[PDB]
Design a protein around this nucleic acid. Structure first.
Lengths: 488, 488
RNA sequence: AUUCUCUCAUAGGGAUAACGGUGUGGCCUUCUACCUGUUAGAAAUAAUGGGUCUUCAGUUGUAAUUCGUUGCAACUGACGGGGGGGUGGUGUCAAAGCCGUUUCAACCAAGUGGUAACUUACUUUUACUUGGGUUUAUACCGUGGAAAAGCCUGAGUCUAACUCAGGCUUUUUUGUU
RNA sequence: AUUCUCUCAUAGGGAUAACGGUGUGGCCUUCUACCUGUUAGAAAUAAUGGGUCUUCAGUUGUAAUUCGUUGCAACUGACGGGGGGGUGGUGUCAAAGCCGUUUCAACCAAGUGGUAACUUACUUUUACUUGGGUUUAUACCGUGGAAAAGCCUGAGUCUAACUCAGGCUUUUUUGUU
């Protein structure tokens, strides 16, 4: 297997994946434009197929061009690597404002460069996995981060007291001396081949100071750079997880966390660049008090972890509520708030197509489109597999029944209120439908009525419930684990 | 995917693997009997195809019977699991004498029970991998134990003073209360499903006290029973590895090792059964002295690990020498020590077929059959892949050039001496061949002459060298890692 | 029968001789520096049959250098143990030493009180075979078929002896070849 | 051209209109409790069209029990928020409270100084769609072909005006369908 053939395969697969994503993009845009025409009538805006802007910044950001000449690109890249002259082209960088007031600098390399990065740095990560720490993730959406969450959750539940602290490694990775990185190349038993060292040094030479964040090379270079920090924190006995440019360190002892702070600074001085906490707190039971500055629950990647349970962060709950409310608004209010309702089917005959579309959109967003019979069949044993899609799939570890029950109530209440406003708007337009099915139900009846309603032999009006899919998620976690339910 | 179908697949695959192994066994026996006929002439023993004894102790130990009625076996096993009456049949148990003076009780379950054990306990180990420790292995031949070795090796090289201690958990797993095991079923975030709990309890009920060792269920149950010991040792800051019923705990601090001893004592008390050391020592540079009872090098699974290098254990070197010496003896002396040399080709015309067979046997044992051109192409870059088979494949981490150089000298010397004895014996039988090629070379010439010799255009007289394949092993470790060279 | 198929199936029924593999060589194709006859051929190469090195470290010169280092020469420094018995120089006031010269030893053995054996072997596991796939020959485990030999039992004539029937063991060819 | 093919190839040449995908439905097949018309049929079922629950905790009885627990009934305990404005009881010496009664609110909002909008959207990533595979219809991105309309430029007769040629933009059908 020659290197040129390997580069060919990698570049071609990356290009094909991007092409497939764009094809599905424009197909989705067309299907949605057809549905939106049906929804907003003549007011429906016209389709607008966009192509990513960075496709034009360089021709090699474009999947279609790279697929046009991936053989020549791979040929030249292999020759440049063999002659040790290869240097990656500049990536597209956009500065996104971090909510904490910082700046996260994304880097989108060109398809050839990204392909080479994956080919080599996935190999280096696989070859050196046992030298790296446990809970080290390059992205804050990585599916494996929940393992770290699980650990902290378990610890929080068991430990009488859990001291925690947080750190921002953003500036560390923005400006870390590449000479320090190079000093780590032959330490901690890392198996880095000479050609791999050339590719690492080439991607670093393309940069000037710091490691590119959010890239195929980020995880490996971070682990290689922070290997001594990880070793010192493990020798102290604290547990830690690095996700992107954030690090959480928790322990059962105050002295241990203090010494961890000391370790981070010894590492900061040795690296030439400082690491600053977001800082330190104690997590205890809600009833019991604290001696040091403390909070009841930590917020860790969309989870509010407490000594009593794991729940969804209020920001994440707000996002869920935003999506559900906008589903209902888009399908049941926005069309009726236009200047003309021409081409928009007005509900009649005890049938609202808009309400079915909205309930189904909410069901897709939450369950992934599952029926309550499917979920109950999984919960009973009748069925041995239930696909776990939707928003709850991203919160597999939630065990807060009260939160999900409250969100159930909120879903029902918002359905009632939006339907009432839809009736009011319809009546303004001159279509009395209050007595009809979708607008006559009282709130304390919606669920029941919609549960009984059937169309095409399938109950497509049932109001989706977070608690049912939570039951299923708990069973699926106890039967398959986290990794098997966050992707099929 | 129903449970019966899953059991069917597993039982059939296990039976087929065993059948394939037996077929290859008798085919090998025949090929070797043909070669041995050629070697020992009329004195050659007759073939004797054996079948494993345990195949007859129960019909389900026999792969062929299980393949005969694997459908009925799977049907009944699935029904028994669903009705929660399944109980594994007694395994075959032979008590082997451990060199330390102990007894290792191996357990060979029947093909159905082994298949079920794999099906469920591999799932459990995968689903709970992140809850387990790093260096936990169920066999002392597991390919991943070398990662643990690598870790300690690195530590030894970097640390001045590496306090080590060793522990025997043999009696712990021989008699651990199954109630303690059951108490751990709902701890450390372990995801164990109800059916998995039934299967664990069934395999335990089949036993009475302790965990079966050397089985598919050994690793998981050992991790589940020792999870709190692992957590305590990790909080202390010591690093440890459990291989089978052996545990090595190392640290850079004496206080940490002493506190680890205290932890093991407490865990022994909480389990109702004691854990005894083999005990506590300090590993330092060869030149520098020590305070406490100390040794220059620890012996860990075929490795003599020192602060200066990693070498092969003297017992393992003895084993290598035994195999090479017997190869030469069998092919060059034993046939000539028989009563009659009838049917045995006597060397003449400057060709010794026996010497070629012996050199090729040694090459297979050492290199795996590689040519020195293949190894030099890998070492140079001409060739990008060299399969790593033979004895050195089991010692991928050796970096002791002196040991390999000494073994090179020993190979050349033993070749010379065995050839000289072959010449003497041949002359007794009345066949003077001292002037001929295989009996004329001086020791300090053997390699050179054998290097230049060629047959079929390929140099199959070259004396195999440990150091060349060590160069190749080092390059392959720096290019592919441990996991990729211990199995292709 | 280890094949194929039925039984509310970790066990039992049937029906056919096949099923499952092994070494060699062939094509396919994965990667492989240089120099060469001699076959084709118009110097483009291919199959073939002979040969050479190919690694690591330092020094120095040179080019790049984001000051971690990197490409190229080209010079030497290693690149095949240890032990026993004699014997020469060294190399010192003696002597350890350590240079080399010859003999002994199949290994353990640089050791045991002593030293032979062993590979379908001993064993804490000391464990694996030649990049992936497929078909001309030589085969293999089991099962089936055929023949021969030996032994035992029973029946007919019956002093002997002969014939028939049943059972058991062993050895040879083949359909997979 | 995003197809196919050549150049010692991160770039350039050519040749053809195709390539790459999407929703629906069909078969294949993975797993799916019970009760039912009405179609086939001799009660063996299949496609169909309607309906019910299916989870968790405790108590008790019972069977196993390696004393961790496990199968089965069968009884209740939860199993769809919060807020604002009025209003009844409670439930106390007042009052917090907390039972229920009606209205308001699309969400954020249990809040902002104020409250609307928004899904190809905002964003630290807030990220994904209905078990696997394949073909009748409706399509999609790009490219190609055809037609129509508009604008600009040049040429001939030339006051006008007409004709031709070139370029640019937009909109419609199809070969993939």
């Amino acid at each position: 297997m020659k290197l040129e053939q390997q580069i060919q395969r990698v570049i071609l697969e990356e290009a094909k994946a991007l092409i497939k994503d764009y094809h599905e993009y424009h197909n989705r845009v067309h299907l949605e434009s057809v549905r939106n025409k049906k929804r907003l009538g003549d007011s429906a805006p016209d389709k607008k197929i966009h192509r990513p802007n960075y496709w034009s910044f360089d021709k090699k950001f474009d999947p279609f061009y790279v697929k046009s000449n991936y053989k020549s690109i791979a040929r030249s890249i292999a020759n440049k690597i063999e002659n040790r002259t290869y240097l990656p082209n500049e990536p597209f960088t956009k500065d996104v404002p971090k909510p904490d007031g910082g700046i996260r600098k994304v880097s989108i390399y060109q398809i050839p460069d990204a392909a080479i990065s994956k080919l080599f740095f996935n190999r280096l990560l696989a070859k050196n996995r046992h030298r790296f720490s446990s809970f080290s993730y390059a992205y804050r959406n990585d599916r494996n981060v929940h393992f770290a969450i699980q650990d902290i959750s378990v610890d929080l539940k068991k430990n009488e007291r859990t001291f925690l602290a947080e750190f921002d490694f953003s500036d560390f990775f923005g400006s870390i001396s590449h000479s320090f990185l190079n000093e780590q190349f032959n330490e901690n038993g890392f198996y880095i081949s000479p050609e791999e060292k050339f590719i690492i040094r080439s991607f670093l030479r393309e940069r000037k100071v710091g490691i590119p964040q959010g890239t195929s090379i980020s995880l490996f270079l971070a682990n290689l750079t922070c290997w001594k920090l990880d070793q010192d924190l493990e020798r102290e006995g604290v547990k830690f997880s690095r996700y992107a440019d954030d690090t959480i360190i928790w322990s059962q002892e105050y002295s241990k966390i203090c010494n961890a702070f000391n370790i981070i600074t010894n590492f900061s001085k040795s690296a030439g660049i400082k690491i600053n906490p977001k800082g330190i707190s104690l997590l205890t039971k809600k009833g019991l008090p604290s001696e040091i500055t403390s909070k009841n629950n930590l917020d860790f990647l969309g989870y509010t972890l407490s000594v009593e349970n794991v729940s969804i962060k209020e920001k994440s709950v707000k996002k869920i509520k935003k999506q559900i409310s906008y589903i209902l608004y888009r399908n049941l209010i926005q069309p009726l708030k236009k200047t003309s309702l021409a081409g928009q089917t007005i509900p009649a005959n005890d049938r609202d197509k808009n309400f079915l579309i909205a309930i189904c959109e909410i069901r897709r967003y939450m369950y992934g489109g599952l029926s309550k019979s499917q979920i109950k069949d999984y919960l009973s044993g009748r069925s041995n597999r239930l696909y776990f899609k939707g928003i709850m799939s991203f919160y597999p570890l939630v065990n807060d029944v009260e939160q999900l029950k409250q969100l159930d109530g909120w879903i029902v209440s918002v359905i009632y209120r939006a339907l009432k406003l839809r009736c009011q708007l319809l009546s303004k337009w001159g279509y009395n439908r209050s007595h009809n099915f979708p607008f006559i139900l009282d709130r304390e009846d919606i669920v029941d009525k919609c549960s009984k309603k059937t169309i095409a032999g399938r109950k497509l009006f049932e109001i989706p419930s977070f608690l049912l899919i939570h039951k299923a998620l708990q069973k699926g976690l106890q039967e398959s684990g986290i990794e098997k339910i966050m992707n099929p």
